[PDB]
Design a protein around this ligand. Structure first.
Ligand SMILES: C[C@H](O)c1ccc2c(c1)N(CCCN(C)C)c1ccccc1S2
Length: 182
């Protein structure tokens, strides 16, 4: 089946992130960790990838976002640049949605698409269909209604799960992203 046990890849995690020992949770830290500057690590934003690689097929997982004022979720090319600043955008190899400012939900098209969610999600489901070129996001709190779907994605290599528990803002958004047991 499509359900997949996601774990986080510590080698990609920006130093502002704290990963749980089981690598199923991630949160913003109050200070930067001292860790290596290996090529895989995102150096400019608090992001981290799942360890799993997708080359084909259908895949699904869920993330708890309860009570966070900001976060970003989805999938990206393994080949996306890790160093420096960039746009979280389908044009750049990212298929993501995000919340910021407590109630601004957007999809990472470029230009960005504003999202209008009648029921703020406490848990989000991400569905990847490699062959169909689709990444879809579901509001678990709202009985699995569709938040947004990217279609006509032109996948060419391995894809990775993508996660950010927020950006650095002074330590208000400390709660973790948690991968849900499926
Ligand atoms: C600008 C570029 O696309 C970019 C790079 C890195 C991040 C974000 C955007 N945001 C989205 C902000 C969209 N509007 C507001 C510009 C974000 C949102 C939620 C959690 C982490 C992040 S980190």
């Amino acid at each position: 089946g499509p359900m997949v046990h996601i774990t986080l890849d510590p080698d990609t995690a920006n130093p502002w992130l704290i990963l749980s020992e089981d690598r199923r949770q991630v949160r913003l830290g109050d200070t930067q960790q001292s860790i290596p500057g290996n090529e895989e690590r995102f150096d400019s934003y608090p992001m981290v990838l799942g360890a799993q690689h997708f080359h084909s097929g259908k895949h699904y997982w869920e993330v708890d976002v309860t009570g966070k004022e900001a976060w970003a979720l989805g999938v990206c090319r393994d080949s996306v640049r890790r160093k420096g600043h960039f746009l979280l955008s389908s044009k750049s190899g990212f298929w993501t949605i995000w919340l910021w400012n407590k109630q601004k939900y957007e999809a990472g098209t470029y230009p960005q698409t504003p999202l209008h969610l009648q029921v703020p999600p406490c848990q989000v489901g991400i569905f990847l269909d490699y062959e169909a070129g689709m990444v879809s996001f579901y509001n678990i709190t709202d009985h699995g209604s569709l938040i947004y779907s990217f279609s006509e994605c032109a996948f060419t290599g391995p894809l990775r799960p993508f996660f950010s528990p927020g950006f650095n803002d002074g330590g208000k958004n400390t709660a973790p992203l948690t991968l849900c047991p499926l």
